[PDB]
């Protein structure tokens, strides 16, 4: 049982490391996508402004 408990603790620590790494990975991906989506929204709003400028003629 001592051997089994030590093995179990090692694998549990491995899984904890895994969840931590995945949490950083998802936080970074989310930030990158937030920046890109803001870029897209800005592009769309500027395009709407352009469209009204051409209609103004």
């Amino acid at each position: 049982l001592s051997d089994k408990l030590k093995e179990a603790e090692t694998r549990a620590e491995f899984a904890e490391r895994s969840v931590t790494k995945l949490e950083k990975s998802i936080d970074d991906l989310e930030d990158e996508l937030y920046a890109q989506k803001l870029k897209y929204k800005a592009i769309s709003e500027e395009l709407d402004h352009a469209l009204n400028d051409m209609t103004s003629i």
């Binding site: 769309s44 400028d53 209609t55 003629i57």
Partner: protein
Amino acid sequence: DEDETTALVCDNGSGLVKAGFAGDDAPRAVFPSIVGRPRHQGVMVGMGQKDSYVGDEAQSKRGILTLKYPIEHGIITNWDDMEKIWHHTFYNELRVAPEEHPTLLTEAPLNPKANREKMTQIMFETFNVPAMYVAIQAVLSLYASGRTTGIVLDSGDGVTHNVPIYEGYALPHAIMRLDLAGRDLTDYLMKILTERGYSFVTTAEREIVRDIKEKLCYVALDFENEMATAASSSSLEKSYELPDGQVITIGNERFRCPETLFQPSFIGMESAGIHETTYNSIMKCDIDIRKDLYANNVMSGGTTMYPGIADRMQKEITALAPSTMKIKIIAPPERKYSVWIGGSILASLSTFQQMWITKQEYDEAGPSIVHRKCF
């Protein structure tokens, strides 16, 4: 921040306050004319005890704060909002006190005497200001236009002023104000969208649809023909994406919203459309200068940022007036800020530095005498 003793040009136009130092070409502090007061009472501890939001601080939060308009049709409703917006502009954005430089404010044509006396009293007694001056918007707009002849059409948010100036001469008898502008257009669009199916009855949505109108709504070149061709829509109807994400679909309503200006009967008022009122004003002027007023008509106001107003004006005036002469309509770029721009170029003259009103003479004379001195 400022090393020149020059007046602060603060255009307190209905719907948008535009404040900045003299000499600049555009206002630095531009924020809507709205006041957000806390609706409920919170048991929370730590938040700002501030009981009166203003400007962008209120725009950022419109769901919690009940929104009140500090100006209606032109008449000032609440003076606390006035003190709030000036105190905010002075001690939150410009970072300068009014005790070191003058202040050239711009007021609308044909305003009440109570409004003028009240603002002047708040600017002299409460705040220590070395000198004040009230100016009509039309003259400064004509200055920024770079001419001396024409009829300025200033369409703000709740009032529309037609002011004829020929050979650099004001006509206080012909200035006729009519309370048809962006708010009545927002109300018309709101009721027709409620007719479409999406019903709302709160002010935050009203401001949102106002912004949607500013961005998309345009003027039609032929109302009935566009109605007929929009009956079977394809590219005439557009699908807008609300900032929240709800997919709105708006078709003909766009170019039928500003049409209420041309047909006040939609709001059940006997008043005539802006074009017909301007035409009647031209008949009220003398014949000799009427052609010059036709050739030098100028526009002002944020409401004029819609695309298609110049062409609509040209066709309507051509249909009303003869088609023998030449009737060119000129709209200077960035006309909305032009008024403010004028203020800047008006505050740099030494003579204008000699036409200010200091505290002492006002105090002895009183506000009413000050009204006589200006006009």
